[PDB]
Each structure stands twice: as structure tokens, then as C-alpha cells.
Amino acid sequence: SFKYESAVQYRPAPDSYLNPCPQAGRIVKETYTGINGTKSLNVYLPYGYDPNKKYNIFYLMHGGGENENTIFSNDVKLQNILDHAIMNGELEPLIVVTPTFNGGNCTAQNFYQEFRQNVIPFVESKYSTYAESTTPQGIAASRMHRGFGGFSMGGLTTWYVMVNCLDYVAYFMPLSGDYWYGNSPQDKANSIAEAINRSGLSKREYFVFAATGSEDIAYANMNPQIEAMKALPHFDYTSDFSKGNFYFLVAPGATHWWGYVRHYIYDALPYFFHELEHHHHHH
Amino acid sequence: SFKYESAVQYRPAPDSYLNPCPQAGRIVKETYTGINGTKSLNVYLPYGYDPNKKYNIFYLMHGGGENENTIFSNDVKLQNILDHAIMNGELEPLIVVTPTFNGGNCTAQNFYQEFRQNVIPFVESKYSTYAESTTPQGIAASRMHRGFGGFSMGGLTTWYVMVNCLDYVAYFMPLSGDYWYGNSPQDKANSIAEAINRSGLSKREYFVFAATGSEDIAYANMNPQIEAMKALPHFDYTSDFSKGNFYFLVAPGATHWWGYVRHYIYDALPYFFHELEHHHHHH
């Protein structure tokens, strides 16, 4: 079983996890129409996916110049990691969706709107999540079973998703991404605080697991933001999400490259979705 | 609303709480037969008690030379404190039961057996608790909504209840009571640890809020026991039961007397029954 650590450390997946696992989850290519026109995404279903069961769902965004296919391409191979981790019992089965911020009027920053209105209702009406319906009320009532993350520009997307979508999403994984508000780290922090206040949520209802590499240029802006967030009452700093809600993993020597960032996901994603989960688990 | 503090301090109820509250809960005198013959207890029902609702239940034991009527007599007046705290919103409504360790073969130490077999089934078949039935399975499945405490010899009773009844009871309030096992504080601690291990429970499924006065002779044996318990992995020391599960409140200058001990209860009882509660509360 999984056990929460209070300060989890960078730990890459074994080399063999980058290769195909014979217990492969199905990746389905989907096309949908929304406020930024006709676009595509991929949905990863866990091996043994049973549509009579309910699954947590994690949405994960690519970086600049990439697209909805990148994360599951040979350039990244995240599905192989997911497959092997799920078969070995390190990660509880979940749906992982890779959308895009390209197309139409869409930008990494404004994607949250298409996410709220088109992406969630499209995905979660077809696949089996904890959403009982895809009205605003049904999405909001299943928020504990929904997560959002992304790398670089997709990291930035994640931040704008948290500030605009706390009603719909409880778990956030910004990977090497800055957030732009005011002109100081404190102003960034305070914008996030004000979003949390408007939401009415308690400290046990939102969770942030950020990460980057110590040789990734994103560290320069992320670290002061994280420090300013630590000062806020809204966040209790620890990776033990049974006790707190905010952690920053820094991989020593890691650069701004999917080859490393895929391992952040391997490290952080097993920490998601246990709070108020419907299983009886000791973590 | 109530908010958890990480190190709650001794704070007596206002003087006016010792007087009758016009929103008085009903105290019902009950007689039952069990393994120690025919005996009595009192059941305190909260003001507005609705038998269509479910209530948490706290069992509370008297000291040496006292009886099932003592805690709700003029010598103690706990019901007035309960009444006023419940009317002012400081304590969520609950059933409080005062049994006795007198009669038959019963002793403060061996009461746990009569408690398991006769007291719980008698009380919880008549009054409205979270127990869906009073078989061993129905009691065990409602354990998160059951608590046990007591003063002096009743404190000792509480300890023997924890070591024998973790399957039935999640919250424990030993007040000025020692536990006897081995001849060192570590041996006491290790006996409690071994009981927790046999139960299969996690750290989020049992809670201990101990207390005494700094001028109460019980402090002499309680404090080394508590220290030895702190060292165990089984217990995370803090009164914030959303994060940990073990606290020791020491009232400075307080003596071995109900006049003080009733205030420990006022302080500690609002901390009980919130973990995995069926209400939507921010604490």
C-alpha cells in the first residue's frame, strides 16, 4: 500500500518503467467542439477499467510548442510509467486526460474556461468518474475526485485553473510554471489566497503539489512564489496530505525537460485523491 | 463553530454554566441486568433530542466511592455545563451516559466486560446512536461515534476500556487515572501499543485526550505514562485531531476534585467526534 511521507524526495521511476507494460491501459483519442472550436484530447484508461466503477480523474497539460499527443508520445512515455506503477500497486487506478491549450482563441492562460465549460462535461459524461452529472452542481460535488497539473506553459495553465476552478478541482500539480499577478511574489500568493477565500473551502479541501528541478530556469520564479505561499494561513506545508496541503518538490540537478518531469509525476501523483476517498485505506 | 487548536489550554466554564439552563436536556434513570446483576445508569439526552436523528455517545465513569448518580448530582452539575455549552453552540449535541463500576463482581478495572456485553447493547438499542444494531458487528461499525472517559478510578476504567475495547470505541478521556502494567512507564505504553496493533486500526481511528491537575497526585504516575506514550509511533501528539491523536491537558494549580475535573470535560469534549463525521463542518 501507499504511505504518506511528510517530505517526499525526488525519486525517478526505474528504467524498466519507460518500456511497454503488458498490462496496458487504453488511450482513446477524442475530438470535441467547444468555445475554441473543434479540438482533441487523449484519455488514458487504467488497465481493467470497469465502467461500473468510479475513477478519480487527473487532467494534465503539455508545455509550449507541444500538443495533446505529446505526453503519451515516445518523447515522454508517461503511459508506460502509469501502466507499470498501476500494475505494481504504487498508484491507485485513475483516468488521466491530456488536453491542449492550442486552437481557436485558446492560450495557456485562458484554457480554464474551455476546461470548465467543454472539457469536463465532454469527458465526464462519456467516462466513468465520480461526477453524478456534468452540470455545474455535479462537477462541484465531485471536486475531491478531480485534479489538474501541467508542465511549463501547462504549469502556468494549472495556476490559472486553481485561481478560477477551485469549485471544480481539489488537487493541483504545477510543474515548472510561474503564475503572473502583481509584481512581487507576495502579490501572487495573495491572489491565490483571495481565490481560496471566495471559494468558501477549508484547508482540507484543496491540495497543491508543485515541483521543478534545481537546474530548471522556472525555479527562479517558482521558489519565491512558493515561499510566499508558505507564509499564508491557507496552506500547511508538508507532503503528508492527511495533515497538510502544500508541498514543493525540487529535483536536484534536473533540467527543464520531460525526461525529468515525467518522474515528478511518478512521485507526486500517488499522493493524490486519498482525502475523503470512498475506499478503506490506511496511508 | 468549533476550531481545533494544536495545544488547547485549561479554561474553566463560566460560573453561570454551573446554574440551570432553561434548555435542559433530559436525564433518564435506567436499570438493566447484566453479568454483574441488576444495576443502574443515567442517560443525558441533549435539548431537542430527536430520535429520528443519530447522536454520538460518550460514556463517563465516576471515581472511587461515587456512583452512577454522582456526575449529574449537585456535587458536580455536569449536566448544567453540557446544557449551556450545547445551547451556546460550543458543543455539538450528544448523548452522555453515566454508568457505574459498583455491584456484583464489578470493579473499576473489570467494568469493560460489562460495558461490551450489557451496557452498550442496552443503551444503544433504546436510544438513537450511530449503531445500526447492537451485535458485535454493529457496535464495531459505529466505533467512530463512541467515546469513553472517567475520573480517578474511572480514569483507570478508561484505560482498561481502551486496551480491551478499541474495536468498539475510538475516543478516550482518562482524567486523573493511572494504568497498571509492568513496573515501568514504558511497559504501560507498550501494552497500549500492543493493543493498538492487535486492533488493526490506523493512527486516524483512535484518539486520546488525557487530563489532570498539576496539584493532583495522579499527575505523579500519569505524566511518565504520557511521556512514554509520546515516544510511540502509534500516537502523534497534538490536540488538533484533524492532524494527530493524543494530548495531555494539565490544569495548573488544580487539585483532585470534581470542581476542577468538570472543566477538563468542558475543554476536551468539544474536541470529540469530528473525524469522519457525517456533517459538513470546517474545524
Numbering used by the authors:
A (entry chain A), B (entry chain A): 803 to 1085
How does the study describe this entry?
The RoboDiff forms the core of the services offered on the ESRF beamline MASSIF-1 and, thus far, has been used to mount, characterize and collect diffraction data from over 20 000 samples since September 2014. In all three cases diffraction images were indexed and integrated using XDS and reduced using AIMLESS.
ARP/wARP was then run for automatic model building. Both models were completed manually using Coot interspersed with refinement with REFMAC5.
